[PDB]
Design a protein around this ligand. Structure first.
Ligand SMILES: O=C(O)CCCC[C@@H](S)CCS
Ligand SMILES: [K+]
Ligand SMILES: [K+]
Ligand SMILES: [Zn+2]
Length: 354
């Protein structure tokens, strides 16, 4: 019953040289790491070493051209870096961005390998920059490479190609890159909960709507849970897991669970506008541990209130270590019931448990 943890100072080197107060702060990971220390959770975890992902490992999900542009950014001058960063949707680049993204991916490869070989039962990855917005051919939303998507492909590469991986994305923003990478894939089930607002919330695409169920062989293996009309919180995420996430995940019977654990849906986040409490994230973590014989990897994504994400991820690590879930504090808002009902009707054809 061992819980793994990976963290490396070197992932702080990715920074915004023009906007030092940019919300994707280097201190995001150190604040989460520091909160684990003062809560005495760090000494109960097994430290997993970080490492750089290889370019061949990046090719599992990303085109060679995209890898080369970011690899070339390591030697650019400040003026070249600003022009290149501005060519993407919400991306800043420094000379250390490429190495930090390599470390974030490679840190998750070691964690998945530790889980899949039984060295640890579950693991948490405090990494940056995030990954779930990165597409096959371009960077997006502070993400350069899709760390969660790469880890799923890496997990299959060290087991079997058809290894069933469930990716739960509870980051408040839709993982557009993760959806597109596995859109035609039946071996990687993608479930995302996200603020939608009829496509007005970032990343501002109708690909995040409930009717996108996957394509080809992947039909039914892409579950979007979009929220519309107002500040969502614990009761809405509790209901979505009870009605949609947990029934679909159990029928899928995953062999590995990856959590794109963004904490920008948390109370107090300056970007999400939601009110999910640290206890809420703990209960969601506890429910996912009932899958894949407890083989759960928590990967940091978004989340930009330093105090909120520190408490929230530490609560998740507390669940992986076996602690009992803390008790929650409300009737579902009408629009939330409407959203859950739309997903149920869209995915009932594919999941008899619905
Ligand atoms: O457009 C917005 O609503 C603000 C920026 C979006 C935040 C994204 S870029 C964070 C990725 S987890
Ligand atoms: K999401
Ligand atoms: K899929
Ligand atoms: Zn986000």
């Amino acid at each position: 019953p061992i819980t793994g943890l990976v963290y490396d100072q070197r992932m702080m080197l990715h920074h915004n040289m023009w906007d030092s107060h940019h919300p994707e702060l280097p201190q995001r990971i150190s604040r989460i790491f520091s909160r684990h220390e003062e809560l005495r959770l760090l000494s109960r975890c097994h430290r997993i070493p970080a490492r750089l992902a290889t370019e061949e490992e990046l090719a599992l999900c990303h085109s060679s051209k995209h890898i080369s542009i970011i690899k070339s950014s390591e030697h650019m001058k400040p003026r070249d870096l600003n022009r290149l960063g501005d060519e993407y949707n919400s991306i800043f680049i420094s000379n250390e961005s490429y190495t930090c993204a390599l470390l974030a991916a490679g840190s998750c490869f070691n964690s998945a390998q530790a889980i899949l070989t039984g060295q640890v039962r579950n693991a948490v990855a405090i990494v940056r920059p995030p990954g779930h917005h990165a597409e096959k051919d371009t960077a997006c939303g502070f993400c350069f490479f899709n760390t969660a998507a790469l880890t799923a492909r890496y997990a299959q590469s060290i087991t079997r190609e058809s290894l069933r991986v469930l990716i739960v994305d509870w980051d408040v923003h839709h993982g557009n890159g993760t959806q597109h990478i596995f859109e035609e894939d039946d071996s990687v089930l993608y479930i995302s909960l996200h603020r939608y607002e009829d496509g007005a919330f970032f990343p501002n695409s109708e690909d995040a709507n409930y009717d996108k169920v996957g394509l080809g062989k992947g039909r039914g293996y892409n579950v979007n849970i979009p929220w519309n009309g107002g500040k969502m919180g614990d009761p809405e995420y509790m209901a979505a897991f009870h009605h949609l996430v947990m029934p679909i995940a159990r029928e899928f019977a995953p062999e590995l669970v990856l959590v794109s654990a963004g904490f920008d849906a948390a109370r107090g986040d300056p970007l999400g506008g939601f009110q999910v409490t640290p206890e809420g994230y703990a209960h969601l973590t506890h429910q996912l541990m009932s899958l894949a014989a407890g083989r759960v990897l928590i990967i940091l994504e978004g989340g930009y209130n330093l105090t909120s994400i520190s408490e929230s991820m530490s609560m998740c690590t507390s669940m992986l270590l076996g602690d009992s879930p803390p008790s929650l504090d409300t009737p579902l808002k009408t629009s939330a019931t409407v959203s859950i009902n739309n997903v149920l009707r869209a995915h009932a054809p594919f999941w008899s448990s619905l």
